[PDB]
Design a protein around this nucleic acid. Sequence first.
DNA 1: AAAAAAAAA
DNA 2: AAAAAAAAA
DNA 3: AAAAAAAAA
DNA 4: AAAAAAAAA
Lengths: 161, 161, 161, 161
Amino acid sequence: GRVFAPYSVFKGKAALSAEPRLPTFNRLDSGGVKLNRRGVIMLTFWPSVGERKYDWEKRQLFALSATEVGSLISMGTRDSSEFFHDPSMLSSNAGQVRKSLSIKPNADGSGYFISLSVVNNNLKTNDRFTVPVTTAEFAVMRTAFSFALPHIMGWDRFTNR
Amino acid sequence: GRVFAPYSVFKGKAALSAEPRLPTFNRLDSGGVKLNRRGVIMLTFWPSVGERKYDWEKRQLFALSATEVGSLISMGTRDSSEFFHDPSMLSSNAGQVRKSLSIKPNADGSGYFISLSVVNNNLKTNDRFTVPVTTAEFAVMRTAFSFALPHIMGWDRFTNR
Amino acid sequence: GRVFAPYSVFKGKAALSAEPRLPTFNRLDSGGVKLNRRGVIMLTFWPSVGERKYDWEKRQLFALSATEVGSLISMGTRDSSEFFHDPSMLSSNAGQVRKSLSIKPNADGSGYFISLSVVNNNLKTNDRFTVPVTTAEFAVMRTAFSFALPHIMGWDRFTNR
Amino acid sequence: GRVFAPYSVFKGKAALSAEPRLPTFNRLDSGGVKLNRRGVIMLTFWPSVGERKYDWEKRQLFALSATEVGSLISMGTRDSSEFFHDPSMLSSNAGQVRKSLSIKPNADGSGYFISLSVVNNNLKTNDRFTVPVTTAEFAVMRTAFSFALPHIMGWDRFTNR
DNA sequence: AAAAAAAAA
DNA sequence: AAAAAAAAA
DNA sequence: AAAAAAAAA
DNA sequence: AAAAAAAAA
């Protein structure tokens, strides 16, 4: 069944969590198997309430596709990226909620800021969580994401015995 | 049985697909096992017909060997490579069909063009599919190909328990 | 059960050993599984007594977290790092024992010195083991640690079949 | 049982083959397991007789340890290394046979020469096989060796389920 | 014997 | 449908 | 709760 | 046929 092993970073103003969501397959009637819904690396941001305590109730999610992951793992020290998502895309509720994830180098080069911005035009809200990530932490993510990439793409099914 | 989990890139004029084809083994009569036919990373190109629709019927294939894969994964941002294949090599139908795959940096350095050219002297045809690949996409391929390399070489059979 | 396969470096004044300690999980009552205690890469230092012989009785341990590992694997040739640990942290016996691990480039750039310093204010002792590590050896550690990182984080549980 | 999946390079004057030899373990009476004899990446060189044919009878072997592998995978384009081995080391027949493997950059930077030199003072012979390796081929070896490194060290036994 | 804790299904 | 072959247990 | 879709065995 | 040894559960 499920497995819950997130890599988490807890900082002053918010927490950040990351974990793979594996792809789903379908057993063709030809006998073989076929990849159905794509894996992602799910990012969870949540707010620090009171003192070193965190409000899981107010979390926001951002799903990194294979291609966004490749974008993060191939980032230089001075590079930055920005991803834009609509959860209710190609559906009835589109344009209402808008998420943007930005990864920017801090001035020192000592790391990066990762922030999730959520604008909800239905509930008339505007949230923003930012978490600083050291060079070491981002190194864990780079290495963990690279490990995970083949798996969310379903390439770990190509094995000899 | 089979597993179908291609990494695909869909662009203006054509689509590109990539997936490992595992090596085949033979159970020696000595008891052990021996690698028989070599794995490849198969590339499939196909043409965009009408509007964001793609003509799977007109696809062309290109099989990357272990060594060609090593050539792609070790490419710098400014490097380019070109591979030349005859499907009916060392057989009766050689010289008739000629395939060439070129990976070139786009001017921006924002990625690469991958194109397959097929010249068929039997059917008197000349096809060319080109697909632009961003830095992020080519990063997925590099990471996915590196993951896959040991597997198509059959080295995933060397495992402790 | 247990598995004992340390990578070891034996030098003039001391020995150094490194091996992963896997994370522990808990089978939720929801059916799924949940990561409980975190994996580390355990480092063991011990003193050379007499001539090319080593006093296992006087060993000192240092547990690298996921994040410390990411710090070591992402070190340039000229970089150095220093980690500080209190084994009896957040408990009753804190402040008494203090461990610090330093990884510094040797002058040549031919490698690094890895040293563990242990100050025990209970037993009134002060130990220091230093082991030089060549570029090749540190390359084994970098590659072995990167391989191990996903595993100590419990990400090897996310697998397709 | 055995598995035979060598990566091979066939050139003008000789052939080169490479494959992992896994470590051996012992089931402790404590229940757990303990690594016994170390894995290597075995290199096999053999001479080209006549025209594109190769004399397997005259092969010479060279066993790369974990540390030698780390030395090869961390080589820059312009780096070179040289390893020296006595097969009958610490035994009665030492000093008699002497093997040396050299990896040097070719002038172009288009690759490397890998050569095995064997001097046998018992049989009064002196053999030398040299095989040029392109950047692509050496990229396969680097990637395949890095994949294999954890395995020959027995670290693939540290797995979650 | 090991630096811990912070959300949660 | 795929570029092959070269040593061998 | 998650940005989707495009070929196909 | 292979470069070995050094601590230990």
